[PDB]
């Protein structure tokens with residue numbers, strides 16, 4: 001009979017904004033598209049961008065605790081990576097130049113910890129820039145040379161380009177990764193720029209497409225679902241009524257588990273008010289929001305290019321990345337600049353908004 | 366469509382450990398894998414019970430054969446050691462406890478294989494406890510004449526015209542049903558294979574290059590058996606001496622009385638006084654069946670009604686293989702048993718020719 005998953009859980013980490021090393025662009029697109037693909041396959045996904053050492057360790061340790069008997073897990077990392085005496089390491093964004101293994105996450109130790117699990121399937125995919133049923137995919141590419149033409153910017157990396165066209169196939173994961181490796185070989189344009197090593201201990205016909213076992217509302221199942229729901233909570237849409245009668249709608253969208261977009265629009269303006277501007281300000285110092293990047297006419301201007309399609313139009317947009325850096329409640333100000341018909345003077349009002357700890361910030365861990 | 370420049374293989378089976386538990390499966394597995402690879406047009410070197418120095422010489426010489434486009438296969442069956450993520454092949458002279466220095470480093474062999482422009486390089490470990498296209502199979506599951514778990518499943522799939530990675534994946538799947546290895550991580554496959562390579566791929570239209578000649582010569586040089594001898598004794602008795610290869614370091618010697626004059630009422634021929642280096646126990650020599658010498662695998666191809674002697678550890682031969690063919694006979698009527706002997710020199714047979 002057909003193989004089944006107890007559950008399907010995934011942790012996707014994309015590092016781009018390196019403090020002491022070259023900046024990367026592909027992790028943003030790859031993490032976003034892989035998230036949507038795994039969602040189609042009924043995975044609960046945590047997608048995190050630009051994590052420090054402490055943040056990566058917390059994320060990986062908590063992902064591993066979800067790996068109960070029969071659970072299908074997937075760990076994906078895209079960013080800088082290095083090899084030191086056969087051992088590979090994932091480089092966090094706060095890593096000093098040059099790398100030191102103690103500042104990095106040891107790949108082999110994660111594989112060792114995965115081995116101790118009774119998972120139905122455990123897929124660990126490394127997309128680095130240079131019985132547990134574990135399938136390890138180690139992809140390496142050279143970093144872009146200084147005088148090389150930067151292409152699309154919204155382009156996928158070589159590994160995701162090939163992986164995304166095969167990942168939805170109802171096929172044994174080992175067989176599937178083998179065909180991705182072959183497709184990479186068949187492309188002479190990528191033949192010298194991208195490598196893929198697959199390591200497998202898979203002894204059964206497991207696939208990412210395998211169905212999740214019939215609804216068992218166990219405490220173990222509820223723990224996994226709660227922990228993932230707890231981190232994917234968006235504040236509800238707000239209607240702020242100003243004393244002058246002007247009504248502002250405040251909306252919240254998620255781009256990643258640590259990335260939220262805030263948007264505002266004037267939903268009601270009394271006939272007596274002629275000019276009317278709403279804008280957000282005074283964000284927690286921890287989020288490091290540059291006001292120059294806030295209140296934009298388009299999401300693309302905020303550095304938000306993935307959710308841009310799903311966002312309501314004719315709003316002012318603010319991108320709140322690095323949500324895991326929020327220690328307190330997300331408190332900010334909604335400012336209003338208005339003017340009555342005829343009158344020269346501009347009247348000003350403001351309302352403080354507290355939206356709690358949204359998305360991954362809710363994790364007091 | 367894909368082709369091999371050549372097909373070369375080194376198979377090592379360690380069983381008779383001096384300071385460690387003895388193994389049984391390497392004998393059967395090495396023998397059967399040799400025959401299977403031969404059907405696939407591989408030139409094979411099959412070696413049993415090698416010391417550290419012997420294993421290093423064998424592996425270093427196998428690696429030198431790995432020219433551009435060559436298909437290589439390295440197989441090791443015996444004891445293994447894991448020390449801080451690194452695996453090691455344990456030679457038969459390993460002390461107890463053993464150290465990494467006395468053992469062969471797996472990762473260093475993979476590193477040396479990476480430096481090659483081989484069309485395919487298959488390194489299979491079956492242990493107890495231009496790009497290179499390396500496929501690494503690491504098995505950890507190692508009565509009497511039975512195969513090991515890994516070879517049991519590998520031998521029923523190995524002749525299939527199928528990509529080696531796909532083929533090893535199916536062996537892993539099949540192995541994940543067998544009662545002894547049920548739900549155990551008993552096979553890890555590591556691959557960098559980016560093309561559709563198989564062990565069944567044909568060898569490129571046989572060229573006559575010096576490179577090709579080097580590979581063929583070196584393998585030919587190590588598989589030379591002495592020719593069958595007819596020894597005529599002064600009394601008229603004729604003994605036929607035959608030689609068979611079981612492994613590259615294992616030869617079977619067999620004798621039969623081919624002619625007996627009518628005046629001789631009864632006679633016995635037996636072999637004796639073998640070089641001290643071969644460490645032949647006379648108690649194990651001159652048996653009525655090959656199975657009694659510890660040689661069941663070549664038994665079917667051997668002539669029957671002979672006396673059999675198994676000469677294993679041929680790589681320990683420093684000199685020429687010199688021994689005695691003894692004759693005990695008795696004339697009609699007479700009570701006395703007459704004795705004669707002839708010394709035989711058969712050179713350095715099989716892997717002993719290397720030195």
Ligand SMILES: CO[C@@H](C)c1c(NC(=O)Nc2cnc(C(=O)N3CCCC3)c(Cl)c2)cnc2cc(Cl)nn12
Nearest residue numbers: 009010011044046055058059062063227228231324
């Ligand atoms: C959300 O569900 C959890 C259980 C979960 C993971 N856990 C995390 O990522 N955990 C944390 C924990 N802490 C931090 C952190 O440093 N801070 C700073 C203060 C705010 C958090 C960060 Cl980035 C991440 C990982 N993978 C999955 C996949 C599924 Cl499905 N769930 N899941």
Ligand SMILES: CO[C@@H](C)c1c(NC(=O)Nc2cnc(C(=O)N3CCCC3)c(Cl)c2)cnc2cc(Cl)nn12
Nearest residue numbers: 373374375408410419422423426427583587680720
């Ligand atoms: C390149 O040479 C050929 C024969 C060859 C290999 N070479 C060896 O096995 N070489 C040695 C060399 N020396 C020793 C040894 O220690 N002694 C002690 C004195 C007598 C030998 C031993 Cl056991 C083995 C290895 N694999 C292959 C595969 C094919 Cl195809 N050919 N091939």
Ligand SMILES: [Mg+2]
Nearest residue numbers: 651652653654
């Ligand atoms: Mg007998």
Ligand SMILES: [Mg+2]
Nearest residue numbers: 656661664665
């Ligand atoms: Mg028999």
